[PDB]
Design brief:
There is one protein chain. The chain has 162 residues and is mainly beta. The chain is 0% helix and 57% strand. It has no helices and 14 strands. It has strands at residues 2-7, 11-12, 22-27, 33-38, 49-55, 60-62, 75-77, 82-89, 92-100, 105-114, 117-128, 132-143, 151-153, 157-161. The radius of gyration is 15 Å and the shape is globular. The N and C termini lie close together (5 Å). The structure holds a molecule of 3 linked components (GLA-FUC-A2G). A molecule of 3 linked components (GLA-FUC-A2G) binds at residues 46-48, 89-90, 143-146. Forms the head of the spikes and mediates the recognition of specific host cell surface glycans. It is the viral hemagglutinin and an important target of neutralizing antibodies. It comes from Rotavirus C (isolate RVC/Human/United Kingdom/Bristol/1989) (RV-C). This is Outer capsid protein VP8*. It is found in: Virion.
């Protein structure tokens, strides 16, 4: 495993994700912050997209890319330190995937399904009902939002791959 960072580039090219599995990793931030986005500059319901945030417990996280959508999933009141992926693909208008940020580093795993499709994977240990626990292990397949659309990186990040 090769782990490099902190990278400060503002764009990861889609073409650099198609060859191998890539972890995008973050030291735990001190407050809620937008981490990355895949999608056009302004919301376009015809295209798949996703936007990843870190959310600090007790704060409200509101999507930037989805700020104009008519859907309550565009905000999240964090009840744990967490990662939040606002996303849309296919006939899903908007969902938010939340995983708890259990350690001093966290992030997402990108697995290429083909040159134009990626599986985004997120995991974390969460509680509910005050004493039930769950290892959330989630993934979703995304086609590239459209040709030419890369990943916007808004904070420094680490990359891990083989
Ligand atoms: C929401 C989503 O997942 N968008 C993808 C998708 O978009 C396609 C698809 O939804 C089909 C219906 O099955 O309809 C169009 O073909 C649509 O194309 C997208 O929207 C049109 C209006 C154009 O802007 C076109 O350029 C755009 O691709 O699949 C495509 C790949 O074919 C992309 O992956 C979208 O993000």
């Amino acid at each position: 495993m090769e782990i490099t960072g902190p990278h400060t580039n503002t764009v990861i090219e889609w073409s650099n994700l198609i060859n191998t599995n890539t972890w995008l990793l973050y030291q735990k931030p001190l407050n809620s912050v937008r981490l990355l986005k895949h999608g056009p500059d302004t919301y376009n319901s015809n295209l798949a997209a996703f936007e990843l945030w870190y959310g600090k417990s007790g704060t409200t996280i509101t999507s930037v890319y989805y700020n104009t959508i008519n859907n309550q999933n565009k905000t999240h009141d964090a009840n744990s330190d967490c990662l939040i992926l606002f996303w849309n693909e296919g006939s899903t208008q908007l969902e938010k995937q939340v995983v708890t940020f259990n350690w001093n580093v966290g992030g997402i795993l990108i697995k290429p399904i083909n040159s134009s499709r990626m599986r985004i994977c997120m995991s974390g240990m969460e509680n509910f009902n005050n004493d039930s626990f769950n290892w959330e292990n989630w993934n979703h397949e995304f086609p590239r939002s459209n040709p030419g659309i890369n990943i916007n990186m808004y904070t420094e990040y680490f990359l891990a791959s083989s």
